[PDB]
C-alpha cells in the first residue's frame, strides 16, 4: 500500500486568508490563532496576505479570486455565523461552504474551510480559543498539510 | 501579514440593484435604505440603476444579466420571502441564494445578497428600518466595500 | 436612479407552457387560469404552446428544450407536488426548482416557476382558483412582465 | 393554444434501466414491474438493457454513461433508500436526484427518476406492488411518454 | 433484457483511497477493513495508494486529483463525521458528498462514497467493524464492482 | 406453465363508458382521465361512446344494455358514492357492483368497475387526479387489457 | 506470528446449499443472494447444488449427507425461524445449530450457518435484502473463505 502524506513544515509556503467582518468579535481571534500557528510552523509573516470581506456570503468570491492569482500554496477561509431568529443563517452557511468547495475545485489550489457556525455566542467562544481550542489554529495546520500534499499532485 | 481591504468611499461607483415586487410592503423600504446610504457615501443618483422583477425566483436572472453588461462596479439584490403554510418558501430562498452566488462567480462582478427571509411579518419589519436596522442599508455598505476591494483584484 | 420595468401588455408575445400530469386535478385548473390571463392581456391563443409531461421531475427537461428553440419570449412551468408519507416530495420539489432556474440561466429566456407545493389537498385547492387566487394566473402575469423586461436586456 | 404530448405506444423504443443492488428485496420487484409494463406497451425485450450498480450513489454515474452512448430513447433509474438511525439517507437521496437530473440535462436523453425513498420497510412494500401500486410500473409508463414527447424536441 | 454487471475479482486493479485524519479512531479501522478486503479479492498491495487529508471537507479535492491522474480503476473515499453541538456537521457532510459525486462525474473514474456520518460515537463504532460490519469493507467491494462494470463503459 | 395475457395497445378497440351524474364534481374528472388514457393508448375518439345516467343505481342498467349491442370490446363504468348520514350509500354501492358484475357475466363482454366509493370528499379528490392518481385512468388501462385478453377467449 | 487466511476468489470451488421450505417467503431471497454472490466471486453455476428440505429441523440431515459425499469444498445452510406463540421455535433453532455444527465436525467439510432466527416478520425482512443486508450473501462470502482456509488444513 503506498502512503502519500503532507508533513507539517511551513517553511517557504505563501498563504492567503479571507476573513469575514461579521461577528468579528470571534473572527479576529480566529485570525490571531491562524497567524500564530503559521509563523511557529515556519511561514514568514511576509508571506501571508489577508483579505477582509463584509461577511461569509463574500468569502467564496474573495477566495476564488485570491486562488486564481496563483501566488498562494493554500488559502484559509475564516468566518462565524451564529443562529438568529430566522433561517437566513442556513442560506449563508450553505452558500459559503459550497463556494469554498468550488473555489478549490476550479482552481486546483487548496482552500481550507474555517467558518465556525453555531447556535449561540458561547459556542462560538468555545471554538475561538477556549474549551474546544481555536479553529483558526486547526485551519492553519490543515493548510500547511494540504499545501505539502498537493506538491505530490504537481 | 499584508491586509487587503476595500474602504467605504462611494465616489464615482456605478451600482445596479434588482428588487423583487413580492412583499413590496417591505422591499420598497429596503430600496429606500439602499438609495440613501449610497448617496450619502458619495454615489451619484445618476449612477444607480434599478430593475424591478416579479419575485425572488427572478432576482438571479436579472442580476446576472445586469452584471454581464460590465456597466456596474457591484450589484445589489433586494427581496423579502416570509414563511407561509407550505415549503414553497424554501425552494425560492434556496434557488435565489444559489443563483446570486453563481451570478458573481461567472461574472467576476460583486453581487450582494439582500434577501430578507423570515417566519412572519414583524420579523421582516425588524430588518426593514426598525429594531434590527435596515438590510438595504447594510447591503449598500457591503456593495461599496466589495466594489473597492475588487479593484485590488483588477 | 433609473428604473427599468416590464409593463403588462401581452400583445405579440409567444409563450411556451410545460404542465405536469401528476395531480392534474389541480394542474389543469392552473393551465386554465394561465390561458385566460394570457389571452385577456392580449396574447394570441395561436401564439401559446403547451407541452404535457409525466410529473415535476420532467418539467426542467421540457422547459430547457422549449427555451432552446428560441421560439418563445418566456416559458411558464405548472405543477403540483402535495406531501405524502415519505420524503420523496422534497427531492422532486428541489430538483424541479433547481432545473427550472438552470434552464433560464443557460438559455437567457425567462422561465417562470409555477409549481404549487403543499402539505395537503385543501392547500393545493386554495392556490388553484379559490381563497389564495390562482397561481397559473399570477404566473401568466409574471411571464408577460419578464418577456417585456428582458427586451431591455436585448 | 397548441398541445404537444407524447402518447403511450412503446413499439420500437430502446430503453436502458439502472437498478441499485441495495434493498434489492424491493428493487427487483420494481424491475419486474418495469419489465412487464414495457413489454405490454410494445417494447421488445430485446430492446431493454439493464445495468446493476452497488447502490443509489452510483445510479447517476451509470445513467449518464448509458445515456451518452446514444443507444436509448429514455433511461429508467430504480432504487430504494429506507431511513436508518443517522442522516446518511439524505446525502444519498439528495446526490442521487441531483445527478439523475444532471444526466438528462447534459445528455438531452430523458432519464426517469424511480428511487423509492421511505421511512420504513412497509412503506417501501406499499410502492413495490402493493397498496400504492408499483413505482417501476409508473416509471416505465413515464419513460415511454418522455421518449415519445422528446421526438417533438428532435 | 440484457444484464450488464461487474463481477468481484480484483486481480490486476489499481485503487486509490483518500482517508480523513479527523475521527481517525474510526477512520483507521475503515482503512484496515478496505485493505484487507482488497487483498483477499486479489488486488496487489503494491497496487493500492493511500492519500491522508485533514478531514472530510478535503476528501473531494484529493479524490478528483487522484482520479484525474488516470492511474486508478476506482477511488475509495473514507471518513467519519459525528454530530456535535451545532450544524457544522451538515455543511461538511453535504459538501463532502457533493464533491465526491462531482469528482466521478467530471473524471469518468468511479469514486466510492465511504463517509460514515453519525449522531454519536457508538454508532460510528457499529459501522467500523462491529454490529453493522465495516463500511471500509463494503466500500472495497463496491469499488471492485464499479471498476469491473466501467470496463463495459470503455 | 402457459401464460395468457392481454397487452396494452388500444389501436382499433371500440369502448363504451357509462358515467353517473351524481357527484359529477368528481365523475367528470374520472371521465377526463379515462378519455385521455384511451386516446394515448391508441383508441380513436371516434370509437368511444359515453352514456350519462342519474346515479350509480342506474349504471348496471345502461352497462348491460350497451354490452348487449355487441358494438364494444369492453365497457367502462364511472361513479362516485360518498358516505352521508345514513346507510343508503351501502345499498347503492352494493347493487351497483353486483349488477356490473352480472352485466359482464350474462353478456361475455368485459365491464370494468370504476365506482369510487368513499367516506368524505377529500378521499374522492385523492382518487380523481390527485395523491392516489385517477381511477378513470386505471380503469381505461384495465379495459384495454381485458379487451385484449378476451380475444384469447374468442 | 504467522497469519493463515482464506482469500475470497471462488474460481473452481464446488458448493452445496441446503435450503428450508418453511418461511420460504424469506428463504428464497436468501438463496438468490447466495447465488449471486457466488457467481460474482467466480463460482460456476454448474458447480452449485441446492437441496430443498421441509424446514430447519431437516437442514442438519441433508447437510451431513451432502458433506459426506466429498463432492463440495464448503456447504451453505439457509433457513428462517420466526417466533410464534410457544417455545417450539427454540427447540428447532437449537437442534438446527447443533447438527450443523456436528456435520462440519464429523465430516471435516466447512458447513456455514445461515439460519435467520427472529421475533417477527420485519426483522426477517431486514436480514433478507433490506436494511441489514442479506444473510445469504454474507454466508456465500464466508463459505468461499472457509473453503480457501481449509486448503491450509489439507
Ligand atoms: O459572516 C457572517 N455573515 C453574515 N452576514 C450575511 C452575509 O454574509 C453578507 O455579508 C451580505 O448578506 C450580502 O452579501 C451573517 N449574518 O447575517 O448573520 C453571519 O452570522 N455571519
Ligand atoms: O420575493 C418573493 N417571491 C415569492 N414569489 C415566488 C417567486 O419568487 C416567483 O415570483 C414566481 O414564482 C415564478 O418565477 C414569494 N412567495 O411565493 O411567497 C416570496 O415570499 N417572496
Ligand atoms: O408533479 C408531481 N410529480 C410527482 N411524480 C414524481 C416525478 O415527478 C416523476 O413524474 C417520475 O418520478 C420519474 O421522472 C409527484 N409525486 O411523486 O408525488 C408529485 O406530487 N407531483
Ligand atoms: O440504494 C441505496 N444505497 C445505499 N447504499 C449507500 C450508497 O448508495 C453506495 O452504494 C456506496 O455508499 C458508495 O458509493 C443505501 N444505504 O446506505 O442505506 C440505501 O438505502 N439505498
Ligand atoms: O472528517 C471530518 N472532518 C471534520 N473536520 C472539518 C473539515 O472536514 C476540515 O478538515 C477543515 O474544516 C477545513 O477544510 C469534522 N468536524 O469538524 O467535526 C468531522 O466530524 N469529520
Ligand atoms: O352515483 C351516486 N348515486 C347516488 N344517487 C342514488 C341512486 O344512484 C339513483 O340515482 C336513484 O336513487 C334512483 O335510481 C348517490 N347518493 O344517493 O348519495 C351517490 O353518492 N352516488
Ligand atoms: O425452517 C423452519 N422450520 C419450521 N418447521 C419446524 C421443523 O423445522 C420441521 O420442518 C418438522 O417439524 C419435522 O421435522 C419452523 N416452525 O415450525 O415454525 C420455522 O419457523 N422455520
From Swiss-Prot, chains A, B, C, D, E, F, G:
One of its GO terms (biological process) is riboflavin biosynthetic process. GO terms for molecular function: 6,7-dimethyl-8-ribityllumazine synthase activity. The keyword Transferase applies. Pfam families: DMRL_synthase. Optimum pH is 6.5-8.0. 5-amino-6-(D-ribitylamino)uracil binds at residues 22-23, 56-58, 80-82, 113. Catalyzes the formation of 6,7-dimethyl-8-ribityllumazine by condensation of 5-amino-6-(D-ribitylamino)uracil with 3,4-dihydroxy-2-butanone 4-phosphate. This is the penultimate step in the biosynthesis of riboflavin. Is able to use the non-natural R enantiomer of 3,4-dihydroxy-2-butanone 4-phosphate as a substrate, but with less efficiency than the natural S enantiomer. Cannot use unphosphorylated 3,4-dihydroxy-2-butanone, 3,4-dihydroxy-2-butanone 3-phosphate or diacetyl as substrates. Belongs to the DMRL synthase family. This is 6,7-dimethyl-8-ribityllumazine synthase. The lineage of its organism: Bacteria, Bacillati, Bacillota, Bacilli, Bacillales. The gene is ribH.
Amino acid at each position: 500500500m503506498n502512503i502519500i502524506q503532507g508533513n507539517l513544515v511551513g517553511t517557504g509556503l505563501k498563504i492567503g486568508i479571507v476573513v469575514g467582518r461579521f461577528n468579528d468579535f470571534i473572527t479576529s481571534k480566529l485570525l490571531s490563532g491562524a497567524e500564530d500557528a503559521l509563523l511557529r510552523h515556519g511561514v514568514d509573516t511576509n508571506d501571508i496576505d489577508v483579505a477582509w470581506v463584509p461577511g461569509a456570503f463574500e468569502i467564496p468570491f474573495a477566495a476564488k479570486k485570491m486562488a486564481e492569482t496563483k501566488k498562494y500554496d493554500a488559502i484559509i477561509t475564516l468566518g462565524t455565523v451564529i443562529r438568529g431568529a430566522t433561517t437566513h443563517y442556513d442560506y449563508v452557511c450553505n452558500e459559503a461552504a459550497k463556494g469554498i468547495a468550488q473555489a478549490a475545485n476550479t482552481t486546483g489550489v487548496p482552500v481550507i474551510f474555517g467558518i465556525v457556525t453555531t447556535e449561540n455566542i458561547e459556542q462560538a467562544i468555545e471554538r475561538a480559543g477556549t474549551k474546544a481550542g481555536n479553529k483558526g489554529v486547526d485551519c492553519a495546520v490543515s493548510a500547511i498539510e494540504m499545501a505539502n500534499l498537493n506538491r505530490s499532485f504537481e
